[PDB]
Design an enzyme around this catalytic site. Structure first.
Site, short mmCIF file in Angstrom:
data_model
loop_
_atom_site.label_atom_id
_atom_site.label_comp_id
_atom_site.label_asym_id
_atom_site.label_seq_id
_atom_site.Cartn_x
_atom_site.Cartn_y
_atom_site.Cartn_z
N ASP A 1 -1.63 0.47 10.59
CA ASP A 1 -1.46 1.57 9.60
C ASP A 1 -1.70 2.92 10.30
O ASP A 1 -2.79 3.50 10.12
CB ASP A 1 -2.32 1.31 8.36
CG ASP A 1 -1.92 0.07 7.57
OD1 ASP A 1 -0.87 -0.53 7.90
OD2 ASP A 1 -2.66 -0.30 6.62
N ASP B 1 -7.69 7.21 10.05
CA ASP B 1 -7.87 6.41 8.81
C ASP B 1 -8.34 5.00 9.16
O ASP B 1 -7.90 4.05 8.48
CB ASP B 1 -6.61 6.38 7.96
CG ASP B 1 -6.86 5.95 6.52
OD1 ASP B 1 -8.04 6.04 6.06
OD2 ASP B 1 -5.90 5.48 5.89
N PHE C 1 3.74 3.60 -0.56
CA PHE C 1 5.21 3.44 -0.76
C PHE C 1 5.68 2.06 -0.24
O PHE C 1 6.79 1.64 -0.63
CB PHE C 1 6.00 4.60 -0.13
CG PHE C 1 5.65 5.05 1.27
CD1 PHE C 1 5.24 4.16 2.25
CD2 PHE C 1 5.77 6.39 1.62
CE1 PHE C 1 4.93 4.60 3.53
CE2 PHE C 1 5.47 6.83 2.90
CZ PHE C 1 5.05 5.93 3.86
N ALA C 2 4.85 1.37 0.55
CA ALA C 2 5.26 0.24 1.42
C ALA C 2 4.89 -1.11 0.80
O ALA C 2 3.86 -1.18 0.09
CB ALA C 2 4.63 0.40 2.78
N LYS C 3 5.72 -2.13 1.05
CA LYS C 3 5.41 -3.57 0.80
C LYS C 3 5.57 -4.31 2.14
O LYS C 3 6.38 -3.86 2.97
CB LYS C 3 6.32 -4.15 -0.29
CG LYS C 3 6.50 -3.27 -1.52
CD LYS C 3 6.68 -3.99 -2.84
CE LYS C 3 6.41 -3.09 -4.02
NZ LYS C 3 6.48 -3.81 -5.31
N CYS C 4 4.80 -5.39 2.33
CA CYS C 4 4.78 -6.18 3.58
C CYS C 4 5.06 -7.66 3.27
O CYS C 4 4.47 -8.17 2.30
CB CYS C 4 3.45 -6.01 4.30
SG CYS C 4 3.48 -6.61 6.00
N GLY D 1 0.84 -1.22 0.00
CA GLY D 1 0.00 0.00 0.00
C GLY D 1 0.86 1.25 0.00
O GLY D 1 1.80 1.31 0.82
N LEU E 1 -11.77 -0.92 6.85
CA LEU E 1 -11.79 -2.40 6.92
C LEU E 1 -10.37 -2.93 6.64
O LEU E 1 -9.97 -3.90 7.31
CB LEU E 1 -12.83 -2.95 5.94
CG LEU E 1 -14.27 -2.51 6.23
CD1 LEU E 1 -15.21 -3.02 5.16
CD2 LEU E 1 -14.73 -2.95 7.61
C1 LIG Z 1 -0.40 -5.88 10.53
C2 LIG Z 1 0.70 -6.50 9.68
N1 LIG Z 1 0.20 -6.87 8.31
C3 LIG Z 1 -0.10 -8.17 8.10
O1 LIG Z 1 0.03 -9.00 9.00
C4 LIG Z 1 -0.56 -8.49 6.86
C5 LIG Z 1 -0.90 -9.72 6.42
N2 LIG Z 1 -1.79 -9.91 5.40
C6 LIG Z 1 -2.05 -11.18 4.99
C7 LIG Z 1 -2.24 -12.21 5.90
C8 LIG Z 1 -2.50 -13.50 5.45
N3 LIG Z 1 -2.58 -13.76 4.08
C9 LIG Z 1 -2.41 -12.79 3.17
N4 LIG Z 1 -2.51 -13.13 1.85
C10 LIG Z 1 -3.44 -14.23 1.52
C11 LIG Z 1 -1.73 -12.48 0.77
C12 LIG Z 1 -2.62 -11.49 0.02
C13 LIG Z 1 -1.88 -10.89 -1.18
N5 LIG Z 1 -1.43 -11.95 -2.11
C14 LIG Z 1 -0.79 -11.36 -3.30
C15 LIG Z 1 -0.49 -12.84 -1.40
C16 LIG Z 1 -1.17 -13.53 -0.21
C17 LIG Z 1 -2.14 -11.48 3.62
S1 LIG Z 1 -0.59 -7.13 5.97
C18 LIG Z 1 -0.01 -6.11 7.20
C19 LIG Z 1 0.17 -4.77 7.06
C20 LIG Z 1 0.68 -3.97 8.14
N6 LIG Z 1 1.08 -3.34 8.95
C21 LIG Z 1 -0.20 -4.04 5.75
O2 LIG Z 1 -0.65 -4.64 4.77
N7 LIG Z 1 0.02 -2.70 5.75
C22 LIG Z 1 -0.29 -1.84 4.60
C23 LIG Z 1 0.90 -1.76 3.64
F1 LIG Z 1 1.48 -2.95 3.49
F2 LIG Z 1 0.47 -1.36 2.52
F3 LIG Z 1 1.77 -0.90 4.08
#
Ligand SMILES: CCN1C(=O)C(/C=N/c2ccnc(N(C)C3CCN(C)CC3)c2)=[SH]C/1=C(/C#N)C(=O)NCC(F)(F)F
Ligand SMILES: CCN1C(=O)C(/C=N/c2ccnc(N(C)C3CCN(C)CC3)c2)=[SH]C/1=C(/C#N)C(=O)NCC(F)(F)F
Ligand SMILES: [Cl-]
Lengths: 297, 288
Positions: B157, B139, B27-30, B25, B142
Site C-alpha cells: 500500500d 502510512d 477506491f480499490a478491491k483485491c 480499501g 498493521l
Molecule cells: C499484498 C497483496 N494483498 C494481499 O495479498 C491480500 C490478501 N489478503 C488475504 C489473504 C488471505 N486471506 C484473506 N482472507 C481470509 C479474506 C478476508 C476478507 N474476507 C471477506 C474474504 C477472505 C485475505 S490483501 C492485499 C492488498 C494489497 N496490495 C490489500 O488488501 N490492499 C488494500 C486494498 F485492497 F484495499 F487496496
C-alpha cells in the site's frame, strides 16, 4: 496613533489585555484579547476613528454593530459587546481558533464532497437564521466563514449587511464591494435575500472544484462572465452537487432556491454528512467509505 | 460496471482468471488471480476508473504505481506489473496468503517479545531498503504489513508514499490521512524519512502492549496526546524495548533514530530473534 496595550471599557469598567495579532481587513485590525478578572479570551476587532470620519464609513461601522449585536446563533460569530476610546472603536467577539474557510481552501484546494457538505450545511443553517431575522449578509465569502476549535462554522463580518424593513423590500445601496457580486448587484437592478444564495453557490463551487466559478485574472472579464452566467462545472463533480450549483448560480434571482429550499436539497438530505471532522482535515484529506453507514463504529 | 471474470493484458497478451475476493480499501478491491500458461497465483488490485475521475485520485493511483514498480525487496510486496481496461486499472502483486499484522494483533493482542522482534526486524529491513531508495512510505500500519505462507513481512500500500527528489527536501502534501499521525504531520511543519520511524515506534508499542500508544475513544483527545507526546508504557514491558519505543516516539523528528540506527539498537543486537515462526503463532503464543 498607537493601539493601547490594555483596552478599558469606560462604562462597565471591564479591561482587556491585547494579545496575538489575528488579522486585518479594510479599516479594521483583529487581536486575541483576555479579560483581567475572568481571564476569558475573545477576538477584539479594533477600528481607528481616523478612518470613520467619512460619513459612509461611520454608518458602515454603526450598521455592522447594530445588526451583529441583535444576532445569537450557533453558526453566527457571538457578539459580546462594544465600547470606544477617543481614537478607536473596540468590538468583543467569539474567538474562532481555527481561522476561516479561506485558509482551509488555500491549504487543501478542492475538499472531498462529504467535507463540502459538512461546511455548506452549517453555512446554510447560519444564513437561514439571518434571513428569518430579515438580515441579508451580502458579503458571504471563505474569509468571513470562521471555524472554532471543533471546526463549527461561524458567519461574521456584517460590514455590508442590511435589515429588510418588510418582506418584499429590494435594496440598491452598498457601502462596499461584495467579494461575490451577484448579477442583480452588478446590474444595480435591486437585490434581496437571493444575493446570499448566489454567494453560497459560489462558495459551494469553490470548495468542490478548488477554484472560483467566475474569477479570472482581470475584473472586466470576471464581471462579463457573471453578467452572462458564463461558468463551467468539471465532469468529475457528482451530478446532485452539479445540479444544486446550477440552481443557485442563475441570473434570475427568483429562479434560485430560497435558503429553506437550499437546506432541503437532495445534496443535503441524501448525501453523507459527517457528524464531526477530525482536526487533520485542515491540512490533509480524510478517508470516507463509498457509502458510509451509521451501522458501523 | 461489473469486474471481468478474466483479466487480459492488451500489450504482453498475458491473461488472469479472477479467483477469491481478498479484501478492499478506499477506491480499490483485491482478488486472488492466476496466470493461464504458468498457473502462477498473484494478488490482483482492481480500481474502477469511475473513481479515478477526480484528478487528485488519478495522480494518487499513478504515484502508487510509479513508486511501487521501481521497488524489489524481500520485505516489500512484489510488483509484477499493471495494465488497464476502459473501466478498470489492474495491478498484479505478490500474493500474501496469511493476511496482515492487523489480523494477527486482533487475534493475539500483545505478542511475546521474540515475536515482536522477529516482525520489527523485517519491517525495519524493508523500510531501510525504501529510505535508501529515497522512498518515504508515510502510512506504515498493521493493515499494510502483509504476511506470506512462512509469516515473512511484506510492506505494501504505497498509496501515500512519496519520492524524496533532493537532499533535505521536506514534504507537506498528503493525498490521504495516515493511520499513525506523526506530530510534524499533525502540525503541518514539513516531514521527511522520520515519519516512518514514528509509525514503526507506534507499531512496536501496539505489538508489545496490545493497544495503540495514543488512540482514545475520541480523535480530539488522540491528536492532543500526539501533539504533547502524552503516552504511557506499562511496567511489564522489558526496559530495552521500552527504551527503544521512547527513542522512536519523540516529538522532535531529528531526535529519533534513523532507520539504520534502529537496526543497531540493543533490542535487535542482544535480543533472541527466531529464524522462523510456526503457523500456530497466528492464533496461540509460541514456546521459547
Ligand atoms: C499484498 C497483496 N494483498 C494481499 O495479498 C491480500 C490478501 N489478503 C488475504 C489473504 C488471505 N486471506 C484473506 N482472507 C481470509 C479474506 C478476508 C476478507 N474476507 C471477506 C474474504 C477472505 C485475505 S490483501 C492485499 C492488498 C494489497 N496490495 C490489500 O488488501 N490492499 C488494500 C486494498 F485492497 F484495499 F487496496
Ligand atoms: C470572528 C472573530 N475573528 C477571529 O476569531 C479571528 C481569528 N483568526 C485567527 C485564528 C487563529 N489564528 C490566527 N492566526 C492568523 C495565527 C497568527 C499567529 N500564528 C503563529 C498562527 C496563526 C487567526 S479573525 C476574526 C475576525 C472577525 N470578526 C476578522 O478577522 N475580521 C476581519 C477584520 F479583521 F478585517 F475585521
Ligand atoms: Cl467567482
Amino acid at each position: 496613533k498607537e493601539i493601547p496595550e490594555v483596552l478599558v471599557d469606560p462604562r462597565s469598567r471591564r479591561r482587556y489585555v491585547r494579545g496575538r495579532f489575528l488579522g486585518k481587513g479594510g479599516f479594521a485590525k483583529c487581536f486575541e484579547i483576555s479579560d483581567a478578572d475572568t481571564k476569558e479570551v475573545f477576538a477584539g476587532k479594533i477600528v481607528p476613528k481616523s478612518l470613520l470620519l467619512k460619513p459612509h464609513q461611520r454608518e458602515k461601522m454603526s450598521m455592522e454593530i447594530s445588526i451583529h449585536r441583535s444576532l445569537a446563533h450557533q453558526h453566527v460569530v457571538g457578539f459580546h459587546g462594544f465600547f470606544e476610546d477617543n481614537d478607536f472603536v473596540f468590538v468583543v467577539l467569539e474567538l474562532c481558533r481555527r481561522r476561516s474557510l479561506l485558509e482551509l481552501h488555500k491549504r487543501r484546494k478542492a475538499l472531498t464532497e462529504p467535507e463540502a457538505r459538512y461546511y455548506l450545511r452549517q453555512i446554510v443553517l447560519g444564513c437561514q437564521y439571518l434571513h428569518r431575522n430579515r438580515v441579508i449578509h451580502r458579503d458571504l465569502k471563505l474569509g468571513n466563514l470562521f471555524l472554532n476549535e471543533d471546526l463549527e462554522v461561524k458567519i461574521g463580518d456584517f460590514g455590508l449587511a442590511t435589515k429588510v424593513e418588510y418582506d418584499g423590500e429590494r435594496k440598491k445601496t452598498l457601502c462596499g464591494t461584495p467579494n461575490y457580486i451577484a448579477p442583480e448587484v452588478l446590474s444595480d437592478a435591486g437585490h434581496s435575500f437571493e444575493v446570499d444564495v448566489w454567494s453560497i453557490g459560489c462558495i459551494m463551487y469553490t470548495l468542490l472544484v478548488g477554484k472560483p466559478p467566475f474569477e479570472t485574472s482581470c475584473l472586466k472579464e470576471t464581471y462579463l462572465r457573471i453578467k452572462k452566467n458564463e461558468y463551467s462545472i468539471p465532469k468529475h463533480i457528482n451530478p446532485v452537487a452539479a445540479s444544486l450549483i446550477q440552481k443557485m448560480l442563475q441570473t434570475d434571482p427568483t429562479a434560485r432556491p430560497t435558503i429553506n429550499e437550499l437546506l432541503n436539497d437532495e445534496f443535503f438530505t441524501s448525501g453523507y454528512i459527517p457528524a464531526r471532522l477530525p482536526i487533520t482535515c485542515l491540512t490533509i484529506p480524510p478517508r470516507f467509505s463509498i457509502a458510509p453507514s451509521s451501522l458501523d463504529p
